[PDB]
């Protein structure tokens, strides 16, 4: 339960910061502090804003938005802007329908054709 993906760019500002690029895969090391987590991307370790990342659970895919999509709150359809990162379970090429994704504090159903797997 330690796997996350960076949603937003984070430029290191201070010693021990871990630079984040959108789509980076993070192993969480320490979540003692509510605001600043420690984790590892690739060969690097450091601190980053806890609110800049999204949990990736086993079985879930990570996606980047390639074609923007206007959502609707009453329908539970989440908006996607170009290059937005989101996470959810994909389906086969054969199945038709929106999938449920999470993107930080927003969540909802989205078209798979709006997305490219990363």
């Amino acid at each position: 339960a330690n796997s996350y993906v960076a949603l937003y760019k984070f430029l290191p500002q201070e010693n021990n910061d871990l630079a984040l690029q959108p789509g980076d895969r993070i192993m969480l090391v320490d979540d003692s502090n509510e605001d600043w987590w420690k984790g590892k991307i690739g060969d690097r370790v450091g601190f980053f804003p806890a609110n800049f990342v999204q949990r990736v659970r086993p079985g879930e895919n990570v996606w980047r938005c390639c074609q923007p999509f206007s959502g609707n709150k009453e329908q539970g359809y989440m908006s996607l802007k170009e290059n937005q990162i989101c996470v959810g379970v994909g389906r086969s090429k054969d199945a038709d329908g929106f999938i449920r994704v999470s993107s930080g504090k927003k969540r909802g159903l989205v078209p798979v054709d709006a997305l490219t797997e990363i």
Partner: peptide, 10 residues
């Protein structure tokens, strides 16, 4: 895009 926390780093 959330604000980077104003709180101190650990």
């Amino acid at each position: 895009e959330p604000e980077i926390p104003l709180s101190p780093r650990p």
